[PDB]
Design an enzyme around this catalytic site. Sequence first.
Site, mmCIF file in Angstrom:
data_model
loop_
_atom_site.group_PDB
_atom_site.id
_atom_site.type_symbol
_atom_site.label_atom_id
_atom_site.label_comp_id
_atom_site.label_asym_id
_atom_site.label_seq_id
_atom_site.Cartn_x
_atom_site.Cartn_y
_atom_site.Cartn_z
ATOM 1 C CB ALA A 1 -0.799 1.987 -4.940
ATOM 2 C CB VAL B 1 -5.011 6.086 -8.594
ATOM 3 C CG1 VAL B 1 -3.740 6.854 -8.885
ATOM 4 C CG2 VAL B 1 -5.134 4.809 -9.437
ATOM 5 C CE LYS B 2 -2.882 6.940 -0.156
ATOM 6 N NZ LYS B 2 -2.129 6.426 1.017
ATOM 7 C CB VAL B 3 -3.501 12.078 -7.179
ATOM 8 C CG1 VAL B 3 -2.774 13.216 -7.889
ATOM 9 C CG2 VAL B 3 -3.904 10.979 -8.143
#
EC number: 4.1.2.-
Lengths: 222, 221, 221, 221, 221, 222, 221, 221
Positions: B59, B85-87
Amino acid sequence: RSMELYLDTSDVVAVKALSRIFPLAGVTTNPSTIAAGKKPLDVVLPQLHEAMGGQGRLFATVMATTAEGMVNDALKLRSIIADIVVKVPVTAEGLAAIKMLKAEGIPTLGTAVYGAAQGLLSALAGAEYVAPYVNRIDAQGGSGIQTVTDLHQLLKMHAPQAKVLAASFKTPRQALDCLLAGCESITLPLDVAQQMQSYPAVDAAVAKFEQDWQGAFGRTSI
Amino acid sequence: SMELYLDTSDVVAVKALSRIFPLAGVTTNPSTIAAGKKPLDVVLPQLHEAMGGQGRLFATVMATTAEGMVNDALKLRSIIADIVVKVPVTAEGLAAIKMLKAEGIPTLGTAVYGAAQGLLSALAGAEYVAPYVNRIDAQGGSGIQTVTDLHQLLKMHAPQAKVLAASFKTPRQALDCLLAGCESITLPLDVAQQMQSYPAVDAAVAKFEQDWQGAFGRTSI
Amino acid sequence: SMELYLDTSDVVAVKALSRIFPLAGVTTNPSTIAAGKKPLDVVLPQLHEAMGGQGRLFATVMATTAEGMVNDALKLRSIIADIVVKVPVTAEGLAAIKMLKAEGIPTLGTAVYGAAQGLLSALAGAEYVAPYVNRIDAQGGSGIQTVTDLHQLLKMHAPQAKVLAASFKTPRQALDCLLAGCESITLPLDVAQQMQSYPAVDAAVAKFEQDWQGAFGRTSI
Amino acid sequence: SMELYLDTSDVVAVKALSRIFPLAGVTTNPSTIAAGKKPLDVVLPQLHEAMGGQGRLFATVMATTAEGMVNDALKLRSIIADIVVKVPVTAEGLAAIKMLKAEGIPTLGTAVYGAAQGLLSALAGAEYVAPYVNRIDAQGGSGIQTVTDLHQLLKMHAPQAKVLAASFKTPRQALDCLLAGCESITLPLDVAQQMQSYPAVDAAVAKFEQDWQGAFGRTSI
Amino acid sequence: SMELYLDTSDVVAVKALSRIFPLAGVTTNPSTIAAGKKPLDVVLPQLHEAMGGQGRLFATVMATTAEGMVNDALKLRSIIADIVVKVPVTAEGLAAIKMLKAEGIPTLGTAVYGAAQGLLSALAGAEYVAPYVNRIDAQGGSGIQTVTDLHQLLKMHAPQAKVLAASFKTPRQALDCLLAGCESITLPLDVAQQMQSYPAVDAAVAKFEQDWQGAFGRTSI
Amino acid sequence: RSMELYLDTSDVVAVKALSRIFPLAGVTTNPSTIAAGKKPLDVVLPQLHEAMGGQGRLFATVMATTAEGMVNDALKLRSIIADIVVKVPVTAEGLAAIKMLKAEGIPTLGTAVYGAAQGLLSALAGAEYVAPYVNRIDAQGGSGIQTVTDLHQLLKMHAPQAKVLAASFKTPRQALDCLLAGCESITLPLDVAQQMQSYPAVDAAVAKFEQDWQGAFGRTSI
Amino acid sequence: SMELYLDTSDVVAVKALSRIFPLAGVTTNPSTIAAGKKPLDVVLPQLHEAMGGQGRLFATVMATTAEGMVNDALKLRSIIADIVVKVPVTAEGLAAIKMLKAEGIPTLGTAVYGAAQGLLSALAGAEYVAPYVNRIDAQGGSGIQTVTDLHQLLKMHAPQAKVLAASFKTPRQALDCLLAGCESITLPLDVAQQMQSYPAVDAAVAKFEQDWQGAFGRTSI
Amino acid sequence: SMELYLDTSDVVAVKALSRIFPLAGVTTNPSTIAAGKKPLDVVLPQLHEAMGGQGRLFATVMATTAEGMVNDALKLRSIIADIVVKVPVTAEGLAAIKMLKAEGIPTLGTAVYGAAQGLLSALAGAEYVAPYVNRIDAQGGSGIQTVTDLHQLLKMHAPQAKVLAASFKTPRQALDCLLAGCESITLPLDVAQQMQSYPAVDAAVAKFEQDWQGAFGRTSI
Ligand SMILES: CC(=O)[C@@H](O)[C@H](O)c1cccs1
Ligand SMILES: CC(=O)[C@@H](O)[C@H](O)c1cccs1
Ligand SMILES: CC(=O)[C@@H](O)[C@H](O)c1cccs1
Ligand SMILES: CC(=O)[C@@H](O)[C@H](O)c1cccs1
Ligand SMILES: CC(=O)[C@@H](O)[C@H](O)c1cccs1
Ligand SMILES: CC(=O)[C@@H](O)[C@H](O)c1cccs1
Ligand SMILES: CC(=O)[C@@H](O)[C@H](O)c1cccs1
Ligand SMILES: [Cl-]
Ligand SMILES: [Cl-]
Ligand SMILES: [Cl-]
């Protein structure tokens, strides 16, 4: 790390004859060659195993339409031949079946593979062999050889527990070209296997050997 | 050994396709979360259950400062303990990826439009880098060339990271990415659903059935 | 695994970019320290501090004789215990690199304009070899080709050394060096601040925020 | 990892260049011995001393028959205990190489004009094989192609042997040999000097100095 | 590593060439035995002795049926205990090779005119596969291509087998097989006798002698 | 469209001697070799022209540093040899000179070329020949062969009225590699040309011809 | 279209093979003239009439000076008015080729061992250039590579000249030259004969006859 | 521009397939004539009629001597005035091709198993050369490679001649010949019959039909 060479047949007599000549790893059957033989699986599968001297691997194809019915077919096949490899056509239900069978610990081959991504999917699902139909791919206007080439690369990079087991041949050259592309196993139909027994140049070379031998000595024997 | 992901927030689709495909997980982004109308705290556990409790979830942070992105990351991990964690790989995003590496929270660098941008995100600590193949094509580049270059750069210069290619319109795009060596891939729904039908396979199986019926009078084993 | 370096003496910029970029250290040269107008006994501890006491430092000898260069190396190493000594690859420089390898002080062979000169410095004992990519172009050569050849030579014939490519006018030059296998790189300030904005990534994040807003009334997680 | 040699019998040049180049040793041949006018028992220890007592030495047998060549080998080894004996790859020479392998005396197969001949010398026991690059060129062939092929043949079929390329008119021939994988090389004096001193390196160092004296009014560190 | 063989049954020539060439053994075939006019139980021990008791020998079976070929193999092994049995790759020969593998007798598949036939002999258990390079060339095909393909096929699909290329008119044919990766080779006498003298080598040695006598009055060391 | 082989010298006796053996198209001088010859242009240039038997192209370099000075030098050289080709080193002022001389209708050569772009510029300004210094480029760590390769491609695509005239050679192999890359003319220094002047293998073949001829006819001649 | 020549002075063989082969002529040289044991004034007209008055003849000069070679060319042309004069490409031969061009007598440059030598002979005026393919091989080079490079050189730099490859041990060498673009070739007798008969062709003709006999009771019409 | 032929003597099949395919004519051989059990005088005009009286016919000679083959050709031309005479490329057949070109009768060189053989047949005057692709495969070569080489040979060295490839087991073999540039081709009946079934095409057309019906209530225009 030797390659595996199979006969693509259900013809017990031919298997017995060719087993003497070829270094065969086993026999792959499909529903059409089983049906052609006219004998049911519970009869013909032990007969093929016997015809290979009890050695080698057998493959046979599920018939059910749903994934769960395909698992039941697999269970029956294994009860006939305890170490049989179950062939599953790589449809959606077939992929589900292959996952189920990986969970059950039953070895599978993804069959009726017409493209490299479909083949790779069956390997990721758990199949230990993937069988593109080389000549069939050609006949619908593609390249069986290119599919085998791509599929072999994809398995080696992305699903390295699986091997290509190329099928569907009309010439020995097609099978040669698959092996030259890295494909690690192959199943040959009867006529292609029989075209690989000829070579008249070898005969003439042996004949000249005999002429020279029976010419320096008085013998063709040693 | 490769990881196949589904690029959706549609819990029904995830449950259906989990049955067929060998999914390693599901990737969400803000747009498919929104289109699902359900908040993260509801749909993330629904997604996790739809693939039978196994599988990795991804996400995207929403904040625009790096410290804000760390905040988002902590909230997401409290929702799903092993989520990735998508950055988005911006200057601030690169800072966030650095901080999160320090925090021990695995990251993916998303919204990658170029090979060097992707490599930077990997060097900062991202364990996945996601170029947008089809969008790269759409601004006049080549998404396949970016995946090819990015994979080479990661394999020799940031070997802890994988390419996780995203953004597809055709299954062939994904196949080309895999042939170029890309180690994971996330497919949108229509692409995955095109990887389900094969007329020639069904015709071969129907011929098997017909031969079997001609010889044994049955259709079953 | 790769080492990314900043090619500057500007301490305020090192501080600024050390939060964003994943920097391995800083490389100084005579022209850069002279633009700073602060002597090596000041700016080197400042640069070391501006990287949080992390990362490596590189600085170039000024002497013209091998023995002089060795004296300079001892000075620099007395300023920064773990500094890497840059030595221009001249005849005397080669002699100095041999001497410094006998001493056990790590060196980089700098001002490399051709592959053979670079390989010689590595064989003399240099740990890094620094071709000047753009300056080679300006001589009528090809900086990228020299980097490619040098990397192959190092990997076959001097495997304890790495190419540390330098002298860049565009990010594309540096990317091309990395794709050629070059294992480390040092970027001037402007090329660093060209890899830190992508309008497509901002537009993507903006559309993500737009969908999030249009579905939940907030732009927050 | 690579062994760089000087192709000379000139003791002054050896002393002077052993300070600058990372030499692994010196290769003599009858013509350069003769041009020095000093016999082997004088000039070989001079050469060993001019290398600082380290370094590998090579000298050629002069006998025309295998067994005479073996005697020449024993003479050479009495002069320099760990000298490598260069044997021209004739039929008698192949015989000599086999005998010397049985004796435990390391040989080099020299005067190699083709790849098959060189591989034969390595199979007989030679630890080095020395194609004459420029001479091969001068006879209408390609010395680079011969080195390329010979190196492949050695790595596949006689992996204890290395190519030691010899006979050079330009540094570029030497570089092309190294790029083709050639693991050792020996340079004549003029080529070795062309590999030291490049005007663009000197201009670069001069500008470094000049603006180090612009800001700062100094010459040194 | 590579194994070089002589393709002859001429005992005198073997004793002579084993002093020059680095021979691994001798291959015979029925034509060459017949031309020698001596029976196997005479000439095989003679060839063994002429190689000094080292070296491998190969000899061909004469029977047409697989069981008779196994018989011939046992007889051949009684003459030479460690001899390799050459079996022409026919259908019966394939059967004979499988049987001989079961017996623990090492085999060579001979009279090979295409890559697939040779691969089959290796799969049946032959440790060596011998394509007839020049005889393939003569029938309009390409012996080099057959060897290239066969070597690849053995290395990936039958790794316990080596190509032992045979049937040569030029040294260049043998060289090309070796460049293709061929791990062993058997040369006829005239071909071995042509990589045995090189005019430019004798001219180089004569120049050496001339310079050496212009400097030291004498030849010899 | 035959290539043009030139001799890079101003040694009149060497030109007469080597023009007997080789198929020379002309002679290129530069200031250094003219200086070595110790004779001014007004005497060597006619001597070189005659040493080639009147046929053949001649090339000589300007000495002035400004474009208009170089046009002056060019006018003087053309007063000596009416059809001399004027060599102009490719600097900014050299480029201005080449444009002016194009306007004047005086053939020019762009010399002292170390990069492909520089060389192409000189041809665009109007030079009919472009001379990269192959060996000098090799010498400073680059690749004169690659520069010739790129320059030739550039001229054929983008300045098709111009040819590469490669110069600066330590070996005949450098020159052969230029020719293999399509370079259309070449100027050889004396030692390189003189290395192209004997081949032992040929002499051995000829001696064997003579020996067979003698053995059959006892004659050695026709 | 291509010119295929026979490389012989055997009159009986020329008359025989001219019925089978599509020959453009015969190339003689001093060795084969001598082996035929008849002088030029006798055997050249014999060869001419053995080809039925069609076909070009080639013959080699014997003199070693340019003036002598030209004088030989005059004698040759008085025997056969349209003969092509073969000149060995020495320095004197280059001179002779230039002179004969000025005279208008067509020449072939023979005994070419390298591509630049051959190109020079074409530049001097030779209409044909003849590398000794197999002899180049025997010196450790590659006759095939020499033919390839020479053909390219002639087509771009001396387009009035053709490669006329010579000196062959196998038909495969000849084929490889023709595949390289070689526009004419001259075959010795044994290679020429190998190029006609193929057992597989005879076997196919026999199977055709057998089928015909089975269907029609005859082998004819 | 390319010429597609049917390789059969089956008059019925010729009429059927003439309706579908753009045939340029029909190639017969002894085996197919024999299998049809009708003499040349009967079946060749039948085939001509089955082609609508246009297109080329080919038929093979049966004699074994050049002069026999020539008289066979005369008989053939008396049956079909513009027939192309197939001559197997042996020595006698070569002589026959030369004589028939003297007579102005078009010929095809058949039973070609190698590229050199085929080129000889074209140089002798054959307008067509027919390699047996599958039969070349069968004896261990590559028919595709032979076609490729032969086509290049004809285009460079005998431009009045075309490859007319024959002997096929699959449509893919023929496609590969055409992709290699081969300008004409003759297909056996079963390969031609595989080239007229396309399931995916039938499916697309049926989908067209169904959409047309769902919109206009009819299946026609
Ligand atoms: C990040 C993504 O997954 C995008 O590829 C999204 O799926 C697209 C919408 C229109 C073109 S691409
Ligand atoms: C080595 C460097 O740091 C670069 O700045 C390089 O020295 C330049 C290229 C053009 C102007 S300066
Ligand atoms: C083998 C060598 O050591 C080289 O020096 C080579 O033999 C040459 C010397 C002079 C011209 S080529
Ligand atoms: C008998 C063989 O297998 C070959 O080794 C033999 O050397 C040849 C006969 C004709 C050409 S080569
Ligand atoms: C300017 C020229 O024409 C060249 O001859 C030049 O003078 C060379 C230096 C070293 C080798 S060539
Ligand atoms: C001019 C020629 O034809 C000779 O070169 C002859 O063809 C030979 C080749 C190899 C040994 S003798
Ligand atoms: C000569 C021909 O026209 C072909 O029919 C050829 O003879 C064959 C291919 C496969 C079996 S037979
Ligand atoms: Cl340190
Ligand atoms: Cl023998
Ligand atoms: Cl000069």
